[PDB]
Amino acid sequence: KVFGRCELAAAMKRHGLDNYRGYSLGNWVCAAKFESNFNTQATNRNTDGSTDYGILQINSRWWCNDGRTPGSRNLCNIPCSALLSSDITASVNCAKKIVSDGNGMNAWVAWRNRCKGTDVQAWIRGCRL
Ligand code: NA
Numbered sequence: 001k002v003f004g005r006c007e008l009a010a011a012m013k014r015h016g017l018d019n020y021r022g023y024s025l026g027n028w029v030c031a032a033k034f035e036s037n038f039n040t041q042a043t044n045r046n047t048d049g050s051t052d053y054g055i056l057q058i059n060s061r062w063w064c065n066d067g068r069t070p071g072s073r074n075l076c077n078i079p080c081s082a083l084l085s086s087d088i089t090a091s092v093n094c095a096k097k098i099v100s101d102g103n104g105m106n107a108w109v110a111w112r113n114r115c116k117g118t119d120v121q122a123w124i125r126g127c128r129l
Contacts, residue, residue, distance in 0.1 A: 026120035054083035
């Protein structure tokens with residue numbers, strides 16, 4: 001599924017991300033825009049042999065199992081293909097574990113480089129929330 005911008009704010013909000021670990025909803029829409037272009041089905045391979053899956057581009061070296069990432073962990077206890085669903089539930093619940101882990105949202109490269117320190121409220125402007 002390719003979300004609309006307000007459609008995904010609204011959904012993120014329903015699954016408890018506005019202000020999760022102190023990260024306001026715009027930070028998240030912004031991360032999802034630059035990671036996945038808003039598309040639950042986005043996959044990207046990495047040089048280490050890992051792959052990034054779904055709307056938030058969560059990595060198979062630590063968080064999900066894809067069966068082809070040797071010696072990797074599955075810290076969210078789900079196959080990686082669960083992260084490509086039109087229902088962003090599993091992506092959200094795994095994202096809450098990742099943002100808890102010590103480095104906050106800096107774990108999303110593209111958040112760090114494209115969203116951090118910017119006016120991220122602009123990602124939810126106009127939306128009926
Ligand atoms: Na894994």
